[PDB]
Design a protein around this ligand. Structure first.
Ligand SMILES: *[C@@H]1O[C@H](CO)[C@@H](O[C@@H]2O[C@H](CO)[C@@H](O)[C@H](O)[C@H]2NC(C)=O)[C@H](O)[C@H]1NC(C)=O
Ligand SMILES: *[C@@H]1O[C@H](CO)[C@@H](O)[C@H](O)[C@H]1NC(C)=O
Ligand SMILES: *[C@@H]1O[C@H](CO)[C@@H](O)[C@H](O)[C@H]1NC(C)=O
Lengths: 129, 128
C-alpha cells in the first residue's frame, strides 16, 4: 500500500559510491524507477536531507514536482533536472506524492519518502556540490 | 516467451549504451523485471548474441543461477560474473524454461531473453 523502490536507472550517470548515483546537474535526464505499489503515485520529488526516521516528505521536499509516467505496474518513467546540491545538502532522496492524502499527526500529508525494497537498494542520487 | 524490461544490479560501476558494468567475480544480486516469466526456472548469460537468436542452448557461457519470483513481473537472483575474455563483448541474459521445446531437431530449454523495447537497459559486462 506504500510505494517501494528496488532500483533507479538514470539515463546518464557519472559514478557510484555508497548507494548514491551521481548524475549531471542542470541537465534533463530520464529516471527509470522499478518497484512495487506505484499505483497511487502521481508525482516524484526529491528531498535534500533524509532521516531514517522519515515517512512524510512534506517539509523536506526541496525540488519542484516531476510528473511520472507509468509504462507498467512495476515501473515509473520521469524526466528530471537536478540542481547542484548546496554545501548543506547531502543527497537527493526520492519522494512520492500520493493521489490520496493521509493523516499523520492530524496534518494531512501527500508526500512520502520512497521505501527501498531491500535495505541496500540504490535509490539515492547526488550532483556536484 | 519471456521479456526483460529492466535490470537492477545491487552493485555496479558504470553505464554506457544500454550496458551496465558490474564488479567481476563478486556476489551481486540481480532484480530482473519483465513479462512472461512464468515458465522461467534459471538464469544464465551468453557472451555472444545474434539478433536472430532464439535458442541460447549452445550460447550459454555461465553456470545457471536459480531465480526467485518475488512477483509475477520480477525475478530475483544472486549471480557471480567472471571477467569477460577479449573475445566476448558482454553478458546477455538467457532463461531456462520449464518444459523443453524442439528447434532444429534439438531439445532446447534455454532461450535468449528479448528486450521489451529496443532501447532497454538489459545487458551486463565486466572488465575484460
Ligand atoms: C490506491 O488508492 C486506493 C484508495 O484507497 C486503494 O484502495 C483501497 O485498498 C484497500 C485495501 O486494498 C481497501 O480496503 C479499500 O477499500 C480501497 N479503497 C478504494 C477507494 O478503492 C488502493 O489500494 C491504492 N493502490 C495501492 C497500490 O495501494
Ligand atoms: C555467491 O552467491 C551464492 C549464493 O548465495 C553463494 O553460494 C556463494 O558462496 C557466493 N560466492 C561468494 C564468493 O561468496
Ligand atoms: C508455462 O507452461 C505451461 C505449460 O506449457 C503453459 O501453458 C504456460 O503458457 C507457460 N507460461 C508462459 C508464460 O508461457
Amino acid at each position: 500500500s506504500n510505494p517501494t523502490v528496488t532500483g533507479v536507472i538514470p539515463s546518464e550517470f557519472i559514478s557510484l559510491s555508497a548507494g548514491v548515483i551521481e548524475v549531471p546537474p542542470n541537465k534533463n535526464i530520464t529516471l527509470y524507477i522499478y518497484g512495487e505499489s506505484f499505483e497511487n503515485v502521481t508525482y516524484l520529488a526529491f528531498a535534500t536531507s533524509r532521516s531514517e526516521d522519515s515517512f512524510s516528505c512534506e517539509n523536506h521536499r526541496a525540488t519542484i514536482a516531476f510528473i511520472v509516467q507509468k509504462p507498467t505496474v512495476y515501473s515509473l518513467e520521469t524526466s528530471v533536472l537536478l540542481r547542484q546540491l548546496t554545501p548543506f545538502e547531502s543527497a537527493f532522496y526520492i519522494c512520492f506524492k500520493l493521489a490520496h492524502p493521509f493523516s499523520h499527526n492530524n496534518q494531512t500529508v501527500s508526500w512520502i519518502h520512497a521505501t527501498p525494497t531491500y535495505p541496500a537498494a540504490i535509490v539515492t542520487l547526488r550532483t556536484a556540490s
